[PDB]
Every structure is written in structure tokens, then in C-alpha cells.
Amino acid sequence: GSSGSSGPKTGPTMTKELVFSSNIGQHDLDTKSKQIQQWIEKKYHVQVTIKRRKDAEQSEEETEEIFNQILQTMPDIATFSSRPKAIRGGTASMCVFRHLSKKEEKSGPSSG
């Protein structure tokens, strides 16, 4: 049996932001995502920004991974609102996560 209805609320005009280093591991990153997910729920615009070392020995393709690693948790609840790009000269990347404008929700009760 299930019981719990908070109420239909799109939420006020607020924006969230998240900043961390690539060093973050799976154990840690796991938490970072959870937080973002909860936000997206209320259609909260979350701005993510990955920071890399002084020209670390890695290409952009690597910096793109982290991003996906996060969206891989909310692939049916969130989407690449704003494609990630090279910011601050490429040393870092910025992106945002939003809700699936499409009628696709694989979380919660059988939406119908």
C-alpha cells in the first residue's frame, strides 16, 4: 500500500548551482547526483560546472564523461537542458539539467 500526496506545485522562480572537481569518485559523485535529481523534480534549473587541473593530461572527451555519469541517473527524469561547452578557456565545462518536456516519466506511479 502507498499513501502520500504533497501537491501539484511547479515551484517559484529559483535557480540552483553545483560546482566540484573531476577528482570526485563514484562514491562521492553518487551523492552529488542524488542532490541534483531532487532539484530537477521541482523543475529546478541546476547549473553544473566541472573543474579540471592546470591543463590536466586529459582531453575534452574525458570531461564530457562526468556529465553523462550524472544524466545516467536521471535519463528518464532529466535531460541535457543546455549542451555542455568549454568555459573559462576550456579549463572547465558548464551545463544545466531540466525536466523531460516530453510525456516520459519512469519514476513514481504509472502516470496516466
Curated annotation (Swiss-Prot):
Signal peptide: none annotated. The gene is Mtif3. IF-3 binds to the 28S ribosomal subunit and shifts the equilibrium between 55S ribosomes and their 39S and 28S subunits in favor of the free subunits, thus enhancing the availability of 28S subunits on which protein synthesis initiation begins. This is Translation initiation factor IF-3, mitochondrial. It is found in: Mitochondrion. Belongs to the IF-3 family.
